[PDB]
Design a protein around this ligand. Sequence first.
Ligand SMILES: O=C(O)CCC(=O)C(=O)O
Ligand SMILES: O=C(O)CCC(=O)C(=O)O
Ligand code: PRO
Ligand code: PRO
Ligand SMILES: [Fe+3]
Ligand SMILES: [Fe+3]
Lengths: 241, 253
Amino acid sequence: TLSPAQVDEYRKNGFLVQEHVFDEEEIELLRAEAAQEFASGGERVTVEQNTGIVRGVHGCHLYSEVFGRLVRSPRLLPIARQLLRDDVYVHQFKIIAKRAFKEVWEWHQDYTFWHHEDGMPAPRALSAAIFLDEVTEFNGPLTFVPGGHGIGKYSLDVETMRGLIERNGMVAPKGPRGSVLWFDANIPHSSVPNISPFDRGLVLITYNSVENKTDVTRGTRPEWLAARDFTPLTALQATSF
Amino acid sequence: TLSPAQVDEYRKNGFLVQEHVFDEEEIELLRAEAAQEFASGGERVTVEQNTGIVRGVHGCHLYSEVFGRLVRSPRLLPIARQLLRDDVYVHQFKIIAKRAFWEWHQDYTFWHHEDGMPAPRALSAAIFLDEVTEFNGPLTFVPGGHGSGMIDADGWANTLTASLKYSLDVETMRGLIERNGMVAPKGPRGSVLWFDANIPHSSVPNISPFDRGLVLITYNSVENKTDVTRGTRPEWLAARDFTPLTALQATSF
Ligand SMILES: O=C(O)CCC(=O)C(=O)O
Ligand SMILES: O=C(O)CCC(=O)C(=O)O
Ligand code: PRO
Ligand code: PRO
Ligand SMILES: [Fe+3]
Ligand SMILES: [Fe+3]
């Protein structure tokens, strides 16, 4: 679990980075497994329009043994329970390929899209972005308005951003391969394009509160984008095998 | 004049920043004159291909007295001469609007094919009308990538596409960057970024909600004058008058 000093950097800033949570052997396992999901997700892999290039794949924690364990990991599941003062469930899971010379980019709040088109009641959620590769200034890093979480499609306009940014600034947190970037479901952020010539990968996991579940009433999206099964997640039945 | 350390740095990396060359009042005059040039520039204002968004205005030094003086500034002209080892003239002038919310290229490549520049004995001076940060689309360079070795010598729709023109492929850049890195020089308002005609570079979009301005002056060596028989563009993009630039006399007016 996070120190109280880490919990309060997260409460203050709206995001937090822990470095080298995962080692190179575990990351490489995640990279190989992401390649299998790319090669055999069907409708679950997103492709570009006028190009044949793969940008992402979703839902893998429900079709892959490895990713099912990943989301129940002691380096993830506890921190998400702690931070959300609850038991939690995965709202969505994806693997993003930030391709060299990049996609859709506008400043947003995640909560907004979930609230309307899936049915989240409150911003009682977060995301853990696992860095499969080093995040630098030049490979399109997630970029935040720190403190920002406190709202002729769901993108924040320049007039509101103008004000939000004059007060708070902007940060593009960096980090080595194997870092985790935890960020609030109501922090405003944007993806810069990758002007480096090197592809970059991410695993993005959204933990939602159980008390805070979806209302199936409103939902439009298939299970691999928005989750139907709200069973609390627990650590793997504990074993010497 | 640049110190000997600054010249060597320019020659090694292909670029150099000088901070606070122009004071605040100076920048405001340039800003206000730039806004005039955008409102009156007519066919000299350039617009994005699909969207009609205003990107720049060209050749303003031939039409505005402030800008005609600017290219002769004792803050610029002597450095241009120093670095090029010659009399110089203005090959092109633009004002760029990097709007709130691209391709790796070498400037010289375009100038050689379209304007008849016989060699990369030219440079540009980028005057920061606003702070350059990591978030407002700084010009980004491969240090040392302008060296004569660095890249081995050489489609219709591509050439008609502004953002694609004479752009380096990802395979060329992959090699360049592994070995050399990328660097995005930052600076305060009023800084000047000098960069080589042959240095590979790119500009990320501006994701800040603030517009950002830049005055870009390309100086060329007189001995490296453009071959006018190979020129295809109007004077306000590629100059054909090669009068050596001379210092402003210091006077009471
Ligand atoms: O795929 C991307 O580039 C951005 C992912 C993201 O920002 C999100 O959904 O939270
Ligand atoms: O800042 C820009 O829009 C690109 C400028 C540039 O690449 C140049 O003219 O040398
Ligand atoms: O699909 C999702 O859940 C994310 C939320 C913001 C936009 N797309
Ligand atoms: O128009 C020009 O002269 C510059 C040269 C490279 C791209 N645009
Ligand atoms: Fe997002
Ligand atoms: Fe250029």
